Amino acid sequence: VQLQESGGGLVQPGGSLRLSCAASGRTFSSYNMGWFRQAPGKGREFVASITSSGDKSDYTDSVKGRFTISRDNAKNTMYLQMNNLKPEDTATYYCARGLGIYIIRARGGYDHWQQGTQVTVS
């Protein structure tokens, strides 16, 4: 296991949830880290990602202004703060990471994947 997700569960529409993703401190700040999500019968949609240093981040259009990705390199933990949650956001959320040489938007850059956490908006 390279990545361990926390957070998830049930949320009311308009509510908030924080996801987190931990990895080893040895190499933590060498990797971009992001979140993808998957609804049954569909593919893995990019949600957000953040560069190794935390200086750059990006988001899929439908979550801009609602979700914020951040990382605490000191604590070896990355976060997705999900605010104003909507039915469209129900999915399994996967933490992913890839070497910092990749641009964060490159799907092909994500080497490691967590097991996923289910988020259901009531």
Numbering used by the authors: 2 to 123
Copy the relevant paper text.
Prion disease is caused by the misfolding of normal prion protein (PrPC) to its pathogenic isoform, termed PrPSc. We recently reported that an anti-PrP camelid heavy chain antibody or nanobody (Nb), namely Nb484, inhibits prion conversion in cultured mouse neuronal cells in a dose-dependent manner. To understand the structural basis of Nb484 mediated inhibition, here we report two new X-ray crystal structures of mouse (Mo) PrP•Nb484 complexes at pH 6.0 and pH 8.0 resolved with a resolution of 2.1 Å and 1.2 Å, respectively; and the crystal structure of the nanobody Nb484 alone (at 1.2 Å resolution).
Nb484 contains three complementarity determining regions (CDRs), each noncontiguous with the others (termed CDR1, CDR2, CDR3). These regions account for the specificity of the antibody for a particular antigenic determinant. Remarkably, the structure of the free Nb484 changes in the CDR3 from the same nanobody in complex with the MoPrP. More specifically, the orientation of the CDR3 changes upon binding with the MoPrP, thus interacting with β0-β1 loop and β2-α2 loop. Specifically, Ile102 and Tyr103 of the Nb484 undergo major structural rearrangement towards Gly123 and stabilize the β0-β1 loop of MoPrP. In addition, Arg106 stabilizes α2 of MoPrP by binding to Asn174, His177 and Asp178, while Ala107 stabilizes the β2-α2 loop of MoPrP by binding to Gln168 and Tyr169. It thus appears that Nb484 undergoes structural changes in the CDR3 to enable a greater complementarity between the nanobody and MoPrP.
